[PDB]
Amino acid sequence: KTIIINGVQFNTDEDTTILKFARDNNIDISALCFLNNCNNDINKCEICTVEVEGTGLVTACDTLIEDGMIINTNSDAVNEKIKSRISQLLDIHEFKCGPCNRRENCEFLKLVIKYKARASKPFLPKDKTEYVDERSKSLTVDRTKCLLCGRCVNACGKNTETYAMKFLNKNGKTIIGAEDEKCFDDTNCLLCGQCIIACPVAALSEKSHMDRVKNALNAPEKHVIVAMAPSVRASIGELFNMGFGVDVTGKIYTALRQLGFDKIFDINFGADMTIMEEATELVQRIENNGPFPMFTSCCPGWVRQAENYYPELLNNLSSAKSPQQIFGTASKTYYPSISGLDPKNVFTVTVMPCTSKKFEADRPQMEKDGLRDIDAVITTRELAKMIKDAKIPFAKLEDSEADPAMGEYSGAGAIFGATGGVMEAALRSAKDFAENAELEDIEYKQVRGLNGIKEAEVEINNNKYNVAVINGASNLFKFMKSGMINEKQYHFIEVMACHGGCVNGGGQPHVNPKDLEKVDIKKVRASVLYNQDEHLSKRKSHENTALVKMYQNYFGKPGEGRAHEILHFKYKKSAW
C-alpha cells in the first residue's frame, strides 16, 4: 500500500484507520468521540476530519487506509469543517471554565483553544436545574457540559455490558442518562463510574462528599479519621504533574494532616482485616465442603452486579465486610476503646479510587447503634481538589507516617488495588491457616495481570482447589453466560467490576486519550502496589502487628463470636 499524507509518501502493508496510521507516524489528527477503539456511530463528531483526494472530507477515526490514497489533514477546508463542528458544540455548551471541575484537564477546552472556535450563540441557561441530575449516591450528570459524544455509552457497554448508560429522547431532544431517565441507583447500573472516566468534559462527575468532609473538619466536637484506599498512593500524583507510577504515600499522609484531619489511618489496614475474616471463612467452607464457590464481596460494583443480575449468588458471597466498611465498623468500636473518644463524635472519611464506594457507604444497614461505619467517601479526584484549594504544595511535601493503630499494613493488604490482589492476599493467609504453618512461598503470579479471566489450581493442606479471578464486570458476564463456571468446581472467585482492578476505578484521575496510547495505566498504577509488597517486612495480613493487637485485645478470634457479629454483612435475595 502506498499512502500520501501532507505530501509525504508511506509504503505500508498495515490494515488500519487513517487516524491510527497518522498517529503512529507522528502526524497530528484531532479526535473527540473516538475512544476505546469506538467512535459515535450515530451523529459522528467529525473532529477527526481529513481530506482524501478524489473522495472529499472523511472521518479519519473510522476510515481505513487504502493504497493510492492522498490525504490532507490540515487544508483550509478541513480546518473550517472541524472549527465549525466545535463551534456547534459551543452552542450547546456552558463554557465557563473558571469554576469547572475539569478546568485543568478538559479535552473540549484544548480543542476550542486549538481551533480558536467560538459559539454562534453562547449557551447560558439560567435554570441549570433541569440539566443536572444529582439523585445518585455515586454519579452526577450536568448536561450543560454534554457533547453527546457517546463515549460514556460506549465505555459502559464495553466495560460492564450492562448498557446502563443510554441515549434517550427526552421531550424530543437527545440526552444521555439511565433507563427511563431514572436515578442510576434505581437501575441495573453498577455505579462503577467507568462512564465518568470516559467523559472528555465535566458532564459526568462523582457525587460530591466534600461538604460532608469540610463540615465535619470544621465541627469543633468531631474527631475526623481519614484513611485512603490502596490505589490512591499510586495514582494521585498524576494530578500534580508528577507523572505516572509514582509512589506518593508519604506525601499523602502529610497532606491529610495539613488539611486538618485528626487521625491518619489507612484502608490497607482494613484490607488486612478483610483477609483475616475472609481467609478464615474460606478455611471454614473447605471444612464444611461449601457453599462453593465463595465469591469476594469487597467490590460494591460487583455486589450490585450480583444483586441486579445473579441474585442466586448472593448467599455465596463472603460475609466479610469490605476493607472500607470493616475498617469503618472498627473505627466506631475498637478505636474509641483505645483513644477515649465518644463514638458519636468519630467521623470516618475514606479516600477511594471509586464512585461505587459512596453507595456502599450509604447503605442503610452499614451502621450499628446509630453510628455509620463510614460517614463520607471522597474520590482520588476530590482529595486532589481539596489539596489544591488549600494551596498545599503537594509535590514538595516531606514524607510522614500514618498513625499506626489502624494504619499499619502488610504487603498482602498493599496489593488489593490490582486485579488478583485480593485473591493473592487471601491465599497467603488461607494456606497458612489451613496448614497451621508459616509458608515462605507467597507469590501467586498466576492470578496477576490484565487477562480478563484468570484461574489457577492451588494446593491447600494437600488437596487441590480451583480459584478464578474475574477482572472486569463484562468478564463476569462472560464467565457466567458462557458456562465457564461449570467447566470445573470453583472454590474461591475474586470479582472486580473495573478492568485492572481498583487502580482503574471510576474515581481515579482522568488520563487523556493520547497519554493512554503511551502509558499502560493499569499496569503502571498496579506496579506501585506490588513494589510496596516486595519491600514490606510483613507480607501476610495476619502478621500485621497492629491488627494482631486489635484482635487479641478486642475482637477475639476471626470468623466467630464478636468478629462475626459486627465485622460481617450478608446480602439477601428477595423471596419468590
Q: Is omega for the bond preceding 293 within 30 degrees of 0, making it cis?
A: yes
Of these, 10, 34, 184, 492, which contacts ligand FES (CB under 6 A)?
Answer: 34
| Residue 98 cell numbers, joined | 473558571
Using an 8 Å Cβ cutoff, are 346 and 335 in contact? yes
**CA–CA gap between residue 167 and residue 472 (Å, rounded):** 23
CB nearer to Mg ion: pick between 14 and 41: 41
Q: Is 389 helix (H, G, I), strand (E, B) or coil?
A: helix
Give least dist CB 260 to Mg ion, A.
Answer: 6
List 58, 199, 224, 346, residue binding ligand SF4 (CB under 6 A): 199
Residue 409 touches ligand FES, criterion: CB under 6 A:
no
Nearest residue to ligand SF4, using CB? 505
At closest approach, how far in Å is the CB of 192 from ligand SF4? 4
| Residue 176 binding partner per list Mg ion, ligand FES, ligand SF4, none, with a CB distance cut-off of 5 to 8 Å that depends on partner kind | ligand SF4
Question: Does 183 count as an annotated binding residue?
Answer: no
Distance, CA of 73 to CA of 176 (rounded, Å): 31
Point out which span in 81-89, 199-207, 213-221, 448-456 binds ligand SF4 (CB under 6 A).
199-207
Q: Is residue 38 marked as binding?
A: no
Give CA–CA dist 114/47, Å, rounded. Answer: 12
Size of the site for ligand FES (CB under 6 A): 13
Neighbours of 575 (CB within 10 A): 4
Q: Can residue 346 be called a binding residue for ligand FES (CB under 6 A)? A: no
Closest CA to 153 of 174, 127, 137, 171: 174
Which residue, 47 or 497, has its beta carbon nearer to ligand FES?
47
Which one, of 555, 272, 546, 288, lies nearest residue 426 by Cα? 272
Q: What are phi and psi of 168, to 5 degrees?
A: -135, 145
Q: Measuring CA to CA, how many Å separate 158 from each of 11, 154, 301, 482?
A: 34, 6, 15, 17
- 201 lies in the binding site for ligand FES (CB under 6 A): no
Give the Cα separation of 447 and 443 in Å (integer). Answer: 10
Interacting residues with ligand SF4 between 200 and 259 (CB under 6 A): 200-204
CB of 88 to Mg ion, least distance (A): 20
Confirm or deny that 33 is annotated as ligand binding. Answer: yes
What phi and psi, each to the nearest 5 degrees, are found at residue 556?
85, -145
Is 332 in contact with 295 (CB distance < 8 Å)?
A: no
- The greatest distance separating any two alpha carbons of the chain, rounded to the nearest whole angstrom, comes to 80
Task: Provide the minimum distance between the beta carbon of 209 and ligand SF4 in the complex, in angstroms, as a whole number.
Answer: 15
348: left (phi over 0), alpha (psi -120 to 50) or beta: beta
Name which of 34 and 253 has its Cβ closer to ligand FES.
34
Q: How far is the CB of 231 from ligand SF4 (least distance, A)?
A: 7
Residue 33 contacts ligand FES per CB under 6 A: yes
Which residues fall within 8 angstroms of residue 409, CB to CB, at 6 or more apart? 266, 268, 269, 271, 272, 536, 544
Q: Least Å distance between CB 197 and ligand SF4?
A: 8
| Residue 356 touching ligand SF4 (CB under 6 A) | yes
Binding mask 284-323 for ligand SF4 (x = CB under 6 A): ---------------xxx----------------------
Cβ neighbours of residue 76 closer than 8 Å, sequence gap 6 or more: none
From the annotation, which residues make up the binding site?
A: 33, 45, 48, 61, 93, 97, 100, 106, 146, 149, 152, 156, 189, 192, 195, 199, 299, 354, 498, 502
Residues that constitute the known binding site for Fe(2+): 502
Residues that bind ligand FES in the complex, under the rule CB under 6 A: 31-34, 39-40, 44-48, 59, 61
Write out the residues near ligand SF4 by the rule CB under 6 A. Answer: 93, 95-97, 100, 102-103, 106, 108-109, 139, 145-152, 155-156, 159-160, 162, 164-165, 176, 184, 189-195, 198-204, 299-301, 353-354, 356-357, 496-498, 501-502, 505-506
